[PDB]
Every structure is written in structure tokens, then in C-alpha cells.
Amino acid sequence: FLLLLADKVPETSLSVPIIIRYLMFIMILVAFSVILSVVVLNLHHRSPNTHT
Amino acid sequence: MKRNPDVKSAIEGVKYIAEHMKSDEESSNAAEEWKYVAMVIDHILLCVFMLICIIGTVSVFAGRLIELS
Amino acid sequence: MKRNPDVKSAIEGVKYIAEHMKSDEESSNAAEEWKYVAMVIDHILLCVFMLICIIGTVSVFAGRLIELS
Amino acid sequence: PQDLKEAVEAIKYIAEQLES
Amino acid sequence: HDEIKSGIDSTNYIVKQIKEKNAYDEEVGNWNLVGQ
Amino acid sequence: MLIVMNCVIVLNVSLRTPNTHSLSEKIKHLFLGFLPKYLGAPEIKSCVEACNFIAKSTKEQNDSGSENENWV
Numbered sequence: 663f664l665l666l667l668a669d670k671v672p673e674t675s676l677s678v679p680i681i682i683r684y685l686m687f688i689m690i691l692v693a694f695s696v697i698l699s700v701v702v703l704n705l706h707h708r709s710p711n712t713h714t
Numbered sequence: 715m716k717r718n719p720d721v722k723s724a725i726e727g728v729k730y731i732a733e734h735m736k737s738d739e740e741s742s743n744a745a746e747e748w749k750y751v752a753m754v755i756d757h758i759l760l761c762v763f764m765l766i767c768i769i770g771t772v773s774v775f776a777g778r779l780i781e782l783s
Numbered sequence: 784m785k786r787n788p789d790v791k792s793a794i795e796g797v798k799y800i801a802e803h804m805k806s807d808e809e810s811s812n813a814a815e816e817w818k819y820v821a822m823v824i825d826h827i828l829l830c831v832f833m834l835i836c837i838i839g840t841v842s843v844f845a846g847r848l849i850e851l852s
Numbered sequence: 853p854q855d856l857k858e859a860v861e862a863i864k865y866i867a868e869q870l871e872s
Numbered sequence: 873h874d875e876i877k878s879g880i881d882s883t884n885y886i887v888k889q890i891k892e893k894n895a896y897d898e899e900v901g902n903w904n905l906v907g908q
Numbered sequence: 909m910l911i912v913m914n915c916v917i918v919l920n921v922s923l924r925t926p927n928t929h930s931l932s933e934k935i936k937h938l939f940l941g942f943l944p945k946y947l948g949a950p951e952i953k954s955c956v957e958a959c960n961f962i963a964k965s966t967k968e969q970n971d972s973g974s975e976n977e978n979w980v
């Protein structure tokens with residue numbers, strides 16, 4: 663979707679358009695979902711031979 | 715991280731079903747040792763790679779951003 | 784490819800383990816038949832798809848190439 | 853009863869591996 | 873004497889553990905049918 | 909594409925079972941002899957039958973795992 667929008671957004675540096683702010687919000691949210699899923703899987707695959 | 719010919723063949727059965735379990739248990743201990751070693755290596759490389767992620771991101775932009783002010 | 788109260792309850796639990804193992808052996812054979820059938824179908828379709836890959840690639844370019852040479 | 857002893861000890865080993 | 877009793881009661885412990893894993897497995901088959 | 913085909917063939921060989929394929933001495937001798945070197949009362953009759961049946965089944969299962977170990 664970022665690629666899709668790369669050719670339609672003004673190339674000025676006095677502010678960031680609300681649509682790009684929304685896309686970065688969603689992107690960072692997906693990234694944190696990835697991080698916390700890794701954490702959940704790490705907790706799930708623990709055992710007494712490795713962790714107390 | 716954690717720092718009559720029948721009763722004989724029967725008895726023999728049981729005893730095999732025990733020896734085999736013991737064997738499996740040593741093989742499993744050895745594989746757990748290899749898995750512990752891989753987990754330790756993996757923890758060292760998580761620390762190393764987060765260090766590199768920070769250092770190599772500061773060492774590319776610091777110069778210009780410091781001489782600009 | 785190919786082609787007193789407690790010594791009369793231990794005997795019931797041993798026989799129980801026997802039936803359960805038999806039923807498991809019958810279900811595993813039944814599933815092996817389905818796995819053999821899927822494998823045979825898969826080999827037939829590997830041959831079919833290589834034929835279609837060749838025929839349908841020759842039958843699209845042959846005409847013009849013959850007409851040009 | 854040597855055979856028996858081996859049996860009565862294998863059963864034990866099994867029950868132990870099971871508890872653990 | 874006691875030796876026997878000991879084997880006779882570890883065989884019961886084994887039978888019990890088996891009859892108790894079979895239950896758990898039946899209920900996991902039921903959850904599989906619910907999903908299907 | 910050649911390496912995808914090689915991965916598919918190594919997975920096919922490594923996942924073979926005696927129920928599907930027969931491992932032959934020609935193969936084993938072709939891949940496991942010199943190439944690795946050149947390379948890198950009514951109730952008494954209870955356990956009498958059920959225990960031997962358990963033992964057989966266990967042996968069978970173990971042998972069917974050994975065959976796959978050799979394929980691996």
C-alpha cells in the first residue's frame with residue numbers, strides 16, 4: 663500500500679499528510695503485533711529443562 | 715534460563731520395553747544438550763544484533779546531524 | 784514403489800491396553816491405504832502435468848515459427 | 853526368581869518414567 | 873511378598889495413566905469435529 | 909529453479925517409508941559404502957498373550973522407525 667501511494671502524495675517537507683500519518687500508525691501497529699507474537703511464542707515454548 | 719515358553723517371552727518383552735526406553739532417554743538428554751547450546755547462542759546473538767542495530771544506526775547519521783547544529 | 788481385589792484389576796488393565804493397541808493398528812492401516820492412494824494419484828498427475836506443460840507450450844508457438852522459417 | 857526380579861524392576865522403571 | 877504388591881501397584885499406576893490419556897484424546901477428537 | 913528441484917527431490921527421498929518404497933542394497937551400498945568416504949486357570953492366559961502382543965507391536969514400530977532413519 664505504501665508503494666501504491668508513493669506516486670500520489672505531495673513531495674513537500676513543511677508537514678506530513680494525515681494519510682501518511684495513518685499509514686505509519688498502521689505499520690508500527692503491525693510491527694508491534696509481530697514483536698508481541700514472538701514474545702508469546704517464546705513463552706509458549708518454554709520448559710523446565712531451560713527455564714524456571 | 716536454567717543455570718513355560720510363554721511367560722519367558724513375556725518377561726523378555728517387558729525387559730525390552732524397558733531397555734529401549736532407557737536408550738531413548740539418553741538419546742533425548744543428548745539432544746536436549748544440543749538444544750540448550752543453540753538457545754544460549756541465540757541469546758548471545760540477540761544481544762549482539764540489538765547492539766549492532768543501535769550502533770550502526772547512530773554511526774551513519776550522527777556526523778552530519780551533529781555538524782548541522 | 785511397493786508392489787485379590789488388586790490382582791484381578793491389573794489383568795483387566797493389561798487386556799485393555801491390548802485391545803486399544805489393536806484398534807490403533809487397524810486405524811493406522813486404514814489411514815495408510817488413503818496415503819497410498821493419494822500418492823499414486825499424485826504421480827499420475829505429475830506425468831499428466833509434464834505432458835500438458837510440453838504440449839501446450841509447443842501448440843502455442845509452433846505455427847508462427849514454422850510459418851516464419 | 854531372578855527373571856521375576858528383572859520384571860518387578862522394569863515395571864518400576866516404567867512407572868517412574870511415567871510419574872516424571 | 874511386598875515386592876509383588878509393588879509391581880502389582882505400579883502396573884495399576886500405568887493402567888490409570890493410560891486410561892487417563894485416552895480420555896484427554898477423546899475430548900481433543902471432539903474439538904476436532906467441532907472445527908470440521 | 910534447479911535448487912528448488914533439488915530440494916523437492918531430497919525431501920521426497922528423506923520422507924520415504926517402507927510402506928511406500930523399498931530400500932535396496934544396491935542403493936545403500938551406492939550411498940553408504942564409499943561415497944561418504946569420498947565425500948565429507950482362564951485368567952493366567954492374560955498377560956501370556958497381551959504382553960507378547962504389546963512387545964511385538966513395540967518392536968514393529970521401532971523397526972519401522974529405523975528404516976526411516978536410514979532414508980534420512
Ligand SMILES: CCCCCCCC
Pocket residue numbers: 731800886962
Ligand atoms: C505393562 C507394560 C505397558 C507398557 C506401556 C507403554 C506406554 C508408553
